[PDB]
Amino acid sequence: VYPFMWGGAYCFCDAENT
Numbered sequence: 001v002y003p004f005m006w007g008g009a010y011c012f013c014d015a016e017n018t
Contacts, residue, residue, distance in 0.1 A: 004011055 004013065
């Protein structure tokens, strides 16, 4: 459910922090 930081955050870490 948390494929972000797991394999590589691309939202809360990218979506807003590109």
